[model samples]
Target: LTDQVLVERVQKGDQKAFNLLVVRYQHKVASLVSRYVPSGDVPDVVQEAFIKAYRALDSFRGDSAFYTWLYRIAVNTAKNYLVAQGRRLEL
Candidate 1:
């Protein structure tokens, strides 16, 4: 399905559309976040990022590709998770 179609469906309150989006983007989101999250915590972080993105779906604007917005959310979630866990890379 085209992203425009998916985004419109999602905006119209279509849960199936949202699920399709998750299925489509989960791996991309996971792989993107993996670069920031600790290797051991990647799974948890990816799961959390997806859940958060779903919960916040109403805030998504159609001006951007769905995956692009999701990518931002995943990165932010991983970064915030790291900070909360006191995980930091020292120079």
Candidate 2:
């Protein structure tokens, strides 16, 4: 099924479909997030970002690619994880 089909299923409260989507995108999300954090912490960021994305799905209108929306959240999650781990940020 196409991503739009999967996304529609997810928005309809289909957990299994969402899980499939997660499985499809998790590696990409983890890889993008890993760029901002330590190697070992990629899974943590991926998990957190997945949860955040799931919870926030209602806000998605598909104006951007689903992965694009997810990538934004994943990067932000990694940044937050970095700050929480006492990493300094440069403006």
Candidate 3:
């Protein structure tokens, strides 16, 4: 099934549908984040992005392609990690 199909299933209370989305997108999200953060941090940042999306799933209106929305979240998640690291270093 396509992303939109899986998303519809997800919204209908299928947790495994979301898991399928993760399996489908994880590598893409990780690669996107790798460009923004250190390779060592990619896994952690990618997971957080997905977590944010899952928690906010109810608010998704499908106004855009799901990956487009998810990519934005991955971008922000990496940026936020950078900011947090800067704070830790008192920079």
Candidate 4:
């Protein structure tokens, strides 16, 4: 099923559809975080990103691809993790 379909399922409270989305995007989300966060922290950050995404699923308007929204969440989660740990990277 397409991401939109899966998202609709999630909005309708279907856990299986959300699981499918997690399976579909987890790898890309992991890879996106690996570049910013430590290897040891990658899993936690990715998991948190997914959790936040799921909680915020209702706000997803389908204006863009699911992966695109997920990518932003993954990147922001990693950055936030670093911030919390007092790690600052110069831009």
Candidate 5:
């Protein structure tokens, strides 16, 4: 299924669709987060980003590809985690 289709299903309260999305993107998200965060923090940051994305699905405007928005979310989440951990100066 397409990202949009999965997103729409998630918006409609389908947890399975969201799970599919997680399965589809978790590796990419983790890899992206790893580039910005320490290895020990990578999984946590990636998970947090996905949680944020799942919660913010209602705000998704569909103007860009779903992965693009998700990539931004993962990057920002990693930066925020670094700042929170005092390992980085700022986001």
Candidate 6:
């Protein structure tokens, strides 16, 4: 199904559609996320982005491309992670 269709399914509480979206974009997201964090942190950061997206999905409208929204979230996720890191125990 198309992304529009999958998003509709997701909005209707369809878990599998969520997985389909993840499976479809997870790797591209990983590669994109890698630029923002260290190798060890890539996985978690990517997951954070996904987690955030899952929560925010309900508010998502077809105003723009899905990947575009996801991309912004990933960037913000990276920035937020950095802020928390900056506040953590001194290096």
TM-score of each: 0.81, 0.88, 0.96, 0.92, 0.92, 0.92
TM-score of 1: 0.81
Using lDDT, give the best candidate's number. Answer: 3
Candidate 2 TM-score to native: 0.88
Q: Clashing residue pairs, candidate 6?
A: none
lDDT of 4: 0.91
- Please give the lDDT score for candidate 5: 0.92
lDDT of 3 by residue, 1-91 (tens): 9999988888899989999999999999999999999999899999999999988888999999999999999999999999999999899
User: How do the residues 30-71 of candidate 1 rate in per-residue lDDT, one tens digit apiece?
Assistant: 789889976788889988888887778778776787777888
- Give the residue spans of candidate 4 off by over 4 A: 87-91
Which residue pairs overlap in candidate 3's backbone?
A: none
Q: Per-residue lDDT for 6-89 in model 5, tens only? A: 999999999889999999999999989989988987988989999999999999999999999999999999878867878545
Tens-digit lDDT track for model 2 on 1-91?
Answer: 8878888888998878878879899989978987898889899889999999888988899998888888899999998898888844453
lDDT of 4 by residue, 12-91 (tens): 98978999999988898888999998899899999999999999999998889998898998899998998887744543
Counting clashing residue pairs in each candidate, in order, gives 0, 0, 0, 0, 0, 0
Q: Residue pairs in steric clash, candidate 4?
A: none
- Taken over the whole model, the C-alpha lDDT of each candidate is 0.80, 0.87, 0.94, 0.91, 0.92, 0.87
Candidate of highest TM-score? 3
Model 2 off-target regions past 4 Å?
87-91
lDDT of 6 at 39: 79
| Candidate 5, position 83, lDDT | 79
